[PDB]
């Protein structure tokens with residue numbers, strides 16, 4: 001890819017975070033806390049899962065950002081509609097307003113319905129996410145492997161403004177405490 005020059009400075013939106021998450025002062029890192037984080041409930045917060053949105057909203061143009069996933073066992077990354085469900089249980093699918101990939105139990109999968117197996121030779125430490133709003137495209141790149149393509153969603157029905165989407169995952173195992181980090185441009 002040659003997508004870096006549509007680089008956008010993403011920050012995390014505290015108000016959207018599940019109440020167990022800890023967002024750094026610079027709003028560029030998020031991790032799972034060991035307890036509910038002494039914040040009020042609000043209608044924006046994801047209730048059931050360790051999810052948070054970026055502050056930025058996109059309705060046009062090309063956008064690119066990078067996320068560090070070093071030492072994590074489980075995570076979801078991508079973009080979602082501003083209008084996605086926040087409360088209760090749901091699946092990650094384009095029908096529900098999500099364009100995502102994830103790591104789960106040593107397999108990488110794209111959040112189609114049903115999910116799609118990914119073929120990655122070099123487990124990634126940093127992921128690039130590219131959105132072309134007008135083209136209807138969301139693409140994922142393996143920064144650890146010279147920017148190699150991971151997956152492309154095409155003909156996307158964004159149906160409204162988009163937000164960067166993050167899930168740090170649970171830490172039942174004790175092996176998934178590490179943060180997601182937005183990488184410098």
Ligand SMILES: O=C(Nc1ccc2ncccc2c1)c1ccccc1
Nearest residue numbers: 048049050089090091092167169170
């Ligand atoms: O399994 C389901 N959703 C999720 C979503 C996010 C998760 N994040 C961390 C851990 C588990 C998660 C599970 C689901 C929900 C409804 C109907 C069918 C399936």
